[PDB]
Design a protein around this ligand. Structure first.
Ligand SMILES: [Zn+2]
Lengths: 135, 105, 51, 204, 106
RNA sequence: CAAUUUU
RNA sequence: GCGGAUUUAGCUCAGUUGGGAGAGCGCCAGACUGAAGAUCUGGAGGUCCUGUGUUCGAUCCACAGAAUUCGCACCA
RNA sequence: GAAGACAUUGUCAGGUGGGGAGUUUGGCUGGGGCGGCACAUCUGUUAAACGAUAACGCAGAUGUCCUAAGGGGGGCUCAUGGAGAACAGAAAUCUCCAGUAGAACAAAAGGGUAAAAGCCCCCUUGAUUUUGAUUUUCAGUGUGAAUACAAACCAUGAAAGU
RNA sequence: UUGACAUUGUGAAGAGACAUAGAGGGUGUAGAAUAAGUGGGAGCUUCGGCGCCAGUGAAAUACCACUACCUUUAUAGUUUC
């Protein structure tokens, strides 16, 4: 799990969120194995990960990474699209399928409160919008 | 109080629709339930932290609780409901209230 | 209430030792081949007051 | 179906060495307890006998005593009173009149043990005087409740074949499958024993 | 608490009008009450059934309904700043004909 | 081995 | 509210397979010595938790109920 | 070198936990607490002869009881007191005689009832079923209580009727 | 703090229960017996045991497919501490 920091464990709130020891970190633990591998080599673009091994303490992973500067990738147009500067640190904005499902993005009759992000569908549905002719 | 048995009341049914002869029992309200509906809207809400959403009840005043008689029939094994007044000792068996001749001295 | 007096000893605040006199590791020989199959004898040079 | 092919009527007529016929006791394990709630009464239907030799030992005020020679043969009217302490014990299952709701303390009182007059702890008396009383080869051997286990349903003698024994054990087992309900323990379906007195059998 | 029941303050309102402690006298049950005539309410202590409340004492109205052994009267009553028609079912012992408006007839 | 008074 | 436990001589203790009323102290009698005082025997012991039912045979069992109980469980 | 599938680590489950965390800690009231409940109800009175009408005013009461103490029908008349009978007496039972209630009616106090609504005997379970209207508190909202009904079926009576 | 599960592998000792060929305990009076079991009631048996007959006890007797917890208990089988 995770343990919210809270010095000596007294969250100073109402009792509805009082405990500390079984709050469970709403993004995925495969996705936490990239920010602590992206910062080790910030000059490379994280492509994707995959599970490999699992003991009782260390969920092992690999992460496939690409040099965006090695000009066999800047040429050879099958993978030049990751050299684009929108994809810089492509993980922490939630873009790999490790993070796509943590954001919970598909379409259907299930995912109403998330199909473009759960902050746009929050924002478009409760902004009052007023026309200059009062409809 | 004493209540005798066999209590021939107006049955209703759809077979007789007049006075046919029953027999009397009281009941118990059974276990509450698991997997019901309103309980599923309790252990969905008392889950997690916080605890104790819906009010518990401490201040009690009633002595007895309005004992009730099932009138179960014979002709088709239907039954019915009845509610006499509240009673803190409900004697259901025989024990005929006779002409008490001597009064135990 | 407040934190208690016997709980402020646990962070090295002012409750640490006083160390610029205590002049050595009062520990004996790291076991070797000599102390397992013979001996190696030494002299003392002096005895000192501790701190 | 648990007795359909054999073990009741085909491999029982191979081991018999008594010339005389055989009267089939039963072994089966129905669990009921000291909780006197679910006693083993409602004795079953009676289509066919099991080799009567007993001669019934009572006296009659029956409307059929004008013609009490049809299938029974015992005709003494009620007015024997003082002839029952010790002389006759050839009487285990009997009949009775409806007059004996009145006088029956008189021939009981010291003969309490060996069942030589009826009492409150085994009352027979019957007012049904055509079926049970007009078929007197019907020995009404009881399935009466003792505190642990009375399973004594019989079938036939050692001369009765398979087609005659299609009805005999199958509907006369109505005791242990109409009393046995949610209260009942073991044998919603049975664990049977089929042999009378002589040879081997199969306890499934 | 404060005791305002149903028979409250009717100590003398329902007594049997002293030296007439007896049953009803049978000139009472023979006269009929068709709808459309004035009647007034004088209570009856010996009987208990069908008895009105103590306010309808001496008040008067017209009959709108006749039943097996009872009639019904309508009564105007002050409550605040309007009058109400009131419907009340009285058995026949309480109720006589008043001599106010057959002077108007004669 | 139980055991203490007695004008 | 669930599950288990207790209810006797008058006070205090207890055995009964289900084929017997189990010990002492208050009261009373007798004895032993020269009289006491201790000591001895016998007498005065029972809705036997209140029932009901069971089996050939209920002071003791089965089921039910009133006084006390210990843990447990709490959505009007 | 020790220790070795037990410890440790992770998840779930009971127990322990003012060490901490959050929150309440009735209302009336001759100041507040304290005492009482006058906070929900009922009888009489205060109440000034329709009704309504207050005080921590007065004297009391309730959180129950009843298969009969409900329903019906039939027979009888009570509290007392007088006159007399063996044990019999201030207090026993049996007659006769007066006797408007001075008695009894579950439970506070009023009202009511005499071929009874009281005291005895007989017959039962209307203490049933469907849903509406009406009265008193009332804003003429509701709970509780009661009243006249309609339709069914029952009980009782011989019957009117209840 | 205490259980379970996982990290967690490789081999043996035995213990108690589930589990099964099963062995075998019993208060007067009378039965025959001096008695816990369950029932039809008559024979099977080298025996004539009781003959089912009355003899009498708490239900019969001899007798059986086994009807007593079928305990007292050695054994193959499960899981097992
Ligand atoms: Zn019915």
């Amino acid at each position: 799990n995770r343990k919210r920091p809270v010095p000596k464990g007294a969250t100073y709130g109402k009792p509805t969120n009082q405990g500390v020891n079984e709050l469970k970190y709403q993004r995925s633990l495969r996705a936490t194995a990239e920010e602590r591998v992206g910062r080790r080599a910030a000059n490379l673009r994280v492509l994707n990960s995959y599970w490999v091994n699992q003991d009782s303490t260390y969920k092992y992973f690999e992460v496939i990474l690409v040099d965006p500067q090695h000009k066999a990738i800047r040429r050879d147009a099958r993978y030049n699209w990751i050299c684009d500067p929108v994809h810089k640190h492509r993980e922490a904005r939630g873009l790999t399928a490790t993070g796509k499902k943590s954001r919970g993005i598909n379409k259907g009759h299930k995912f109403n409160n998330t199909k473009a992000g759960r902050r746009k569908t929050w924002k478009r549905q409760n902004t009052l919008s007023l026309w200059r002719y009062r409809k | 109080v004493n209540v005798p048995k066999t209590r021939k009341t107006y049955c209703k049914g759809k077979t007789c629709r007049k006075h046919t002869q029953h027999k009397v029992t009281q009941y118990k309200a059974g276990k509450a339930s698991l997997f019901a509906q309103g309980k599923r809207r309790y252990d969905r809400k008392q889950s997690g932290f916080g605890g104790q959403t819906k009010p518990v009840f401490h201040k009690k005043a009633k002595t007895t609780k309005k004992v009730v008689l099932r009138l179960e029939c014979v002709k088709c094994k239907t039954r019915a409901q009845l509610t006499l007044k509240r009673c803190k000792h409900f004697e259901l068996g025989g024990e005929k209230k006779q002409k008490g001749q001597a009064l135990q001295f | 209430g407040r934190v208690i007096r016997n709980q402020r000893k646990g962070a090295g605040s002012i409750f640490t030792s006083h160390t610029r006199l205590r002049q050595g590791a009062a520990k004996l020989r790291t076991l070797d081949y000599a102390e397992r199959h013979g001996y190696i004898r030494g002299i003392v040079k002096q005895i000192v007051h501790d701190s | 179906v648990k007795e359909l092919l054999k073990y009741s009527n085909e491999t029982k007529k191979r081991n018999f060495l008594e010339t005389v016929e055989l009267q089939v006791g039963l072994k089966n394990y129905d669990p009921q307890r000291d909780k006197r709630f679910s006693g083993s009464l409602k004795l079953p239907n009676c289509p066919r006998p099991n080799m009567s030799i007993c001669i019934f030992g009572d006296a009659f005020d029956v409307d059929r005593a004008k013609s009490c020679g049809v299938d029974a043969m015992s005709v003494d009217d009620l007015k024997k009173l003082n002839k029952n302490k010790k002389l006759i014990k050839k009487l285990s299952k009997k009949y009775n009149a409806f007059i004996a709701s009145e006088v029956l303390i008189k021939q009981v009182p010291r003969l309490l043990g060996p069942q030589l007059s009826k009492a409150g702890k085994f009352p027979t008396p019957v007012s049904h005087n055509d079926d049970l009383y007009g078929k007197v080869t019907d020995v009404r051997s009881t399935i009466k409740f003792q505190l642990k286990k009375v399973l004594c349903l019989a079938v036939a003698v050692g001369n009765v074949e398979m087609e005659e024994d299609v009805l005999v054990n199958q509907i006369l087992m109505s005791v242990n499958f109409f009393v046995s309900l949610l209260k009942k323990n073991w044998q919603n379906v049975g664990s049977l024993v089929v042999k009378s007195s002589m040879g081997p059998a199969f306890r499934l | 608490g404060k005791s305002h029941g149903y028979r409250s303050r009717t100590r003398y309102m329902f007594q049997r009008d002293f030296r007439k402690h007896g049953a009803v006298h049978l000139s009472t049950y023979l006269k009929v009450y068709k709808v459309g005539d004035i009647v007034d309410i004088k209570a009856n202590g010996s009987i208990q059934k069908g008895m009105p409340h103590k306010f309808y004492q001496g008040k008067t109205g017209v009959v709108y309904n006749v039943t097996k052994s009872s009639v019904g009267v309508i009564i105007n009553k002050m409550v605040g700043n309007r009058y109400l028609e009131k419907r009340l079912n009285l058995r026949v012992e309480h109720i006589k004909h008043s001599k106010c408006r057959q002077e108007f007839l004669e």
